[PDB]
Amino acid sequence: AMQSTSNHLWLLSDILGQGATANVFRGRHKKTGDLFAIKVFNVQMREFEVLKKLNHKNIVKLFAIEEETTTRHKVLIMEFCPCGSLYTVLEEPSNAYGLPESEFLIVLRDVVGGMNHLRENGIVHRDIKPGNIMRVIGEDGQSVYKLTDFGAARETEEYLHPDMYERATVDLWSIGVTFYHAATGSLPFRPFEGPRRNKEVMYKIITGKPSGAISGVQKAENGPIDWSGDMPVSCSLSRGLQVLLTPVLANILEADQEKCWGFDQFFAETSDILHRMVIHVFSLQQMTAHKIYIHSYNTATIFHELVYKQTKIISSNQELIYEGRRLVLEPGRLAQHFPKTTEENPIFVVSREPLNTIGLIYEKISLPKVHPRYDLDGDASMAKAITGVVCYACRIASTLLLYQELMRKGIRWLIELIKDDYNETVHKKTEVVITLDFCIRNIEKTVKVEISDIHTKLLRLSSSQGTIETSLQDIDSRLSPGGSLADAWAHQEGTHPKDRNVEKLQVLLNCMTEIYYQFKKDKAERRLAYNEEQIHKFDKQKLYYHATKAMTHFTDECVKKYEAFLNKSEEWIRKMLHLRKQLLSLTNQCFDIEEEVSKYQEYTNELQET
Ligand SMILES: CCOC(=O)c1cc2c(=O)c3cc(C(C)C)ccc3oc2nc1N
């Protein structure tokens, strides 16, 4: 069967949504064949017309309105979103523990712009949720998010207000729940098992929320509630974004609506975050990657303060390396004039004073046990959770490999940087002995024409200078490829891209995703055949074997060699800082000596009787 209008037609199997006042399917155009969303509604045209006049990038554009053939049902033709809704995107195991940062900033940008455009024209939306946010591919390949379903008539639950759960600011609540869900991959207020079951406990978590906290989870049967005003360790965003995002959520999820943040200050603080640029920085001594969110007009002084807040490194000790060479940021240089940085090519921050080692902080997760009981909904949910765990193992393994590669590149540049400091001091020593060993014979040039006070002390300069000479060659001996500061252990420890460990985990991940997606098809068709049933259980045992092999290769290879590379890197960090301290001493001694040679080059020239 298929219904139609004057210009469109649509089957019934291609159904996307159904209500009591309208029914939404996908359909074509009789004259063009393009795909459109069709809301067959099953006076009121007043608000339909003013909604038809809208035109914004982040709004599902309501095209036209027509009449159906059989019944004169007033239908609405809308824009079709093949990629689905944000709720659909948050169910792919790649986003099980949070969206990527670039996609998260896209969501925050399009949602805020769409809501501002609705308040600007005076349209209210009660339940803003990931289901009401659609995804459409833009002309530049990047996702574009559009709003829909704002205006209906009736007769979710986890996104309601404490005033409303007993059955704008009230809508800003569902925004904070949506943004926490998109950033963490999970709901902020989770009772034990489904919130639909412990609906009475949900009211306890919402109204009894302490100020400043954003999360509350009950991890046991009738147990307690773990509160936190901080993002979980499994969050996909960087700490530079979490520090700017957390106060927004904490002050828009405020219980008493008298102290909600308000949309005006909300739109201002969000636009402040979106107008910022990102600068990738990598702490070589701490082995940590960072993303500094700074405005295009701030100075390098504020940049050093943000690096301090992420690393506890005093701005007076921050020394920067970029593309092999030094990087001196003037205290007034604007941020938009810095060198452009990526995750693969960041700015390296190092301090002359010793720093502790951290590495990568991730939450150790195990595999959940698979239930041999045949259950379409149970195995579909189990497959989703276990595939998201392997996705998390893929992301951590790729991050560990990037850390090791950035350590290898940063260490190489640091050694070639110390080499330049060495060749600078030798150039200065050779610049001052050219007058020391010269003026000492200028003295004896006058002797053959008391004075021993100069000689018996000037010889104490070359005495204290040859000690620097043998101390410089000892420093150079460590910079030799066989010295104590070798560069080969980085090529011997840890994992390399030629190992292709990330590709092996992604291959097992694609097999698990194929099985999970087939389980997603099985859950819909609530009954399977005998042969399809055996295939379902065969692939479930294959899910266990796939994830077991993935976790085994991850811990017994990716993690183990990473810990060995990091542990061997800490002793090289200590020895490197020891060499920089000695070289700085041998450097300043040449300066304190060159002022004495300049002091005695003129004392030997007395006044003459002329
Ligand atoms: C009332 C507003 O609803 C839309 O406007 C709209 C919605 C959707 C979808 O939820 C959708 C879902 C899927 C999967 C569940 C299979 C696939 C394609 C979809 O495409 C959509 N297009 C729309 N225009």
Q: Please indicate whether residue 86, judged by its CB atom, sits closer than 6 Å to ligand 1.
A: no
Catalytic residue among 34, 127, 256, 522: 127
CA distance 565 to 118: 53
Q: How many CA atoms are closer than 13 Å to the CA of 582, on its beta-carbon side?
A: 17
Identify whether 361 is part of a domain: no
Identify whether 549 is part of a domain: yes
CA distance 331 to 580: 25
Identify whether 480 is part of a domain: yes
Residues 6 or more apart in contact with residue 390 via CB below 8 angstroms? 93, 505, 508, 509, 512, 546, 547, 550, 551
- 85 with 121, same domain: the answer is yes
CA distance 35 to 10: 10
Structure tokens at 506: 């992604």
Structure tokens at 304: 């050093």
Q: How many domains does the chain have?
A: 4
The residue type found at 421 is D
**Best CA proximity match to 384, nearest among 503, 519, 504, 510:** 519
Residue 580 DSSP SS3 = helix
Residues 6 or more apart in contact with residue 437 via CB below 8 angstroms? 462
Resolution (A): 3.2
Q: Is residue 76 within 8 Å of 227, Cβ to Cβ? A: no
Q: Is residue 434 within 8 Å of 595, Cβ to Cβ? A: no
Identify whether 359 is part of a domain: no
Mutate-to-test residue for ligand 1 from 85, 90, 144, 521, highest number of ligand atoms within 8 A of CB: 85
Identify whether 288 is part of a domain: yes
| DSSP one-letter code for 448 | T
| Burial track 19-50 (b if 16+ CB lie within 10 A, e otherwise) | eeebbbbbbbeeeeeeebbbbbeeeeeeeeee
Strands 347-350 and 276-283: parallel
Q: Please indicate whether residue 24, judged by its CB atom, sits closer than 6 Å to ligand 1.
A: yes
How many residues would you count in the chain? 610
Q: Is the dihedral of CA 528, 532, 538, 540 positive or negative?
A: negative
**Best CA proximity match to 425, nearest among 477, 463, 465, 460:** 465
Which strands make up the sheet holding 215-217, listed edge to edge? 189-190, 215-217, 226-228
φ, ψ of residue 34 in degrees (nearest 5) = -70, 160
Q: Which structural domain range is residue 540 located in?
A: 374-610
CA distance 208 to 202: 10
Which residue has 């090791």 as its token pair? Answer: 404
Q: Please indicate whether residue 84, judged by its CB atom, sits closer than 6 Å to ligand 1.
A: yes
Q: Is the dihedral of CA 67, 68, 72, 74 positive or negative?
A: negative
Structure tokens at 243: 């520090």
Q: What angle do CA 8, 11, 12 make, to 5 degrees?
A: 130
Residue 218 DSSP SS3 = coil
CA distance 539 to 100: 29
- 570 with 523, same domain: the answer is yes
- 557 with 527, same domain: the answer is yes
CB atoms under 10 Å from CB of 135, counted, come to: 22
- 178 with 298, same domain: the answer is no
| DSSP one-letter code for 59 | B
- 137 with 201, same domain: the answer is yes
CA distance 418 to 537: 61
User: Looking at the DSSP assignment, which residues form a beta bridge with residue 333?
Assistant: none
Which residues define the annotated binding site?
A: 16-24, 39
| DSSP one-letter code for 559 | I
- 143 with 6, same domain: the answer is no
Nearest-10 Cα torsion for 113, 115, 119, 121:
70
Strands 62-67 and 215-217: unpaired
Residues 6 or more apart in contact with residue 102 via CB below 8 angstroms? none
Residue 557 DSSP SS3 = helix
Identify whether 365 is part of a domain: no
Breaks in the chain after residues, C-to-N cutoff 2.5 Å? 42, 155, 167, 449
Q: In 138-204, which ranges are E strands?
A: 143-147, 189-190
| DSSP one-letter code for 19 | -
- 28 with 111, same domain: the answer is no
Q: Is residue 560 within 8 Å of 552, Cβ to Cβ? A: no
Which CATH number does the domain housing residue 14 bear?
3.30.200.20
Residue 349 DSSP SS3 = strand
Which residue has 């986003």 as its token pair? Answer: 95
For the question of residue 256 being annotated catalytic, the response is no
Distances (CA, A) of 503 to 395, 435, 498: 11, 62, 10
- 54 with 122, same domain: the answer is no
CA distance 236 to 98: 5
- 91 with 52, same domain: the answer is no
- 325 with 453, same domain: the answer is no
